[PDB]
Design a binder for this molecule. Structure first.
Ligand SMILES: NC(=O)c1ccc[n+]([C@@H]2O[C@H](COP(=O)([O-])OP(=O)(O)OC[C@H]3O[C@@H](n4cnc5c(N)ncnc54)[C@H](OP(=O)(O)O)[C@@H]3O)[C@@H](O)[C@H]2O)c1
Ligand SMILES: O=C(O)c1cc(Cl)cc(Cl)c1O
Ligand SMILES: [Zn+2]
Length: 318
């Protein structure tokens, strides 16, 4: 299926996640991405941060070349990293992703995370004592430069990631705004179901896109190892058994029935082909209510390296 974005464009409701932990070799992103396309995924999610935009581009372009899809059938997302928030650096960052990908445009370009870091080819820049080098950038200027990327045709749609209600408002209420964000891409799963923020995005015609929808990659030092493992949840497992599906497939269907566009990363061929079958079954309102009860305020990806600056998104209620 697909959802209609506030700019008239359409986004496939199931997306393929392409971030893998640093230990995972680049080559694996190319094979996985081709497997996802052959399985049925048409929405693909990457970012400069992931250091795979060459491999994913190769994967997409070979699937076009062999006639499996056409470019217009693929919805590809990239993201502007924190070291390029300054207005003059936004279009260069997009153009470089495009060069790496060897594509002419992205379907979606996001502000990745609202805290800015010092410009340069270090994605997490640190001083000689190991402390992060934060930059000072008006995100409204960042947005304005992202808008020009849309005018240019380099990005068909534009959006944000990891923005709270306050930062969404700053954007929507900004003088001379030309384009609303189509989406706010945020952590969302049955432990942390984002109800309050989901209702807010809905109210402004912004799609909630969920990442770490299967409980996150659990990469240290990014994710606390002592956090409960979402896909071990006994209710998701009882639901999996009732419907002859898995706990992952249940997690994913949850998001689709509540008006959320959902991402799923897997570099395992069996899991890739499995995840696209979210479309073959449904949950009752009673079972959706059951999964609502699983909320426990567990945020896997805090990005607390980036706590400190006023722009840190996760101090606010939502
Ligand atoms: N915007 C941001 O700041 C941000 C942050 C985090 C993530 N993202 C995006 O969202 C994507 C997904 O989030 P994520 O990478 O944290 O991973 P995730 O999709 O929540 O999945 C976590 C893990 O689940 C496993 N898995 C996949 N399908 C499964 C299945 N059917 N059964 C059991 N296990 C399964 C995968 O391992 P295998 O590979 O071994 O199958 C994967 O390591 C990322 O790749 C990235 O594209 C964006
Ligand atoms: O996938 C991401 O976008 C992502 C962003 C950040 Cl800031 C950190 C980690 Cl570990 C991620 O996986
Ligand atoms: Zn059922």
């Amino acid at each position: 299926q697909c959802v209609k974005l506030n700019d008239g464009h359409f986004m496939p409701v199931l997306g393929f996640g392409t971030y893998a932990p640093a230990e995972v070799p680049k080559s694996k992103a190319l094979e996985a991405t081709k497997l996802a396309i052959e399985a049925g995924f048409r929405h693909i999610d990457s970012a400069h941060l992931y250091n795979n935009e060459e491999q994913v581009g190769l994967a997409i372009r070979s699937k076009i070349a062999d006639g499996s899809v056409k470019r217009e059938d693929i919805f590809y997302t990239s993201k502007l990293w924190c070291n390029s928030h300054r207005p003059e650096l936004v279009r260069p960052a997009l153009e470089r992703s495009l060069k790496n990908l060897q594509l002419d445009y992205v379907d979606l370009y996001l502000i990745h995370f609202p805290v800015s870091v010092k410009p340069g080819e270090e994605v997490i820049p640190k001083d000689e004592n190991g402390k992060i080098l934060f930059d000072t950038v008006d995100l409204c200027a960042t947005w304005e430069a992202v808008e020009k990327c849309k005018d240019a045709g380099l990005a068909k749609s534009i959006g944000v990631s990891n923005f709270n209600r306050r930062q969404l408002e700053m954007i929507l209420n900004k003088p001379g705004l030309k384009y609303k964000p189509v989406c706010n891409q945020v952590e969302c799963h049955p432990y942390f179901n984002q109800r309050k923020l989901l209702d807010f995005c809905k109210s402004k015609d912004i799609v909630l896109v969920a990442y770490s929808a299967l409980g996150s990659h659990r990469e240290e030092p990014w994710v606390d190892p002592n956090s409960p493992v979402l896909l071990e949840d006994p209710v998701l497992c009882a639901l999996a058994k009732k419907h002859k599906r898995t706990p992952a497939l249940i997690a994913l269907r949850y998001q689709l029935q509540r008006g959320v566009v959902v991402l799923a990363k897997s570099y395992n061929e069996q899991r890739i082909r499995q995840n696209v079958q979210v479309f073959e079954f449904q949950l009752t309102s009673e079972e959706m209510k059951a999964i609502d009860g699983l909320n426990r305020n567990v945020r896997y990806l805090t990005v607390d390296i980036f706590a400190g600056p006023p722009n840190y998104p996760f101090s606010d209620e939502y």
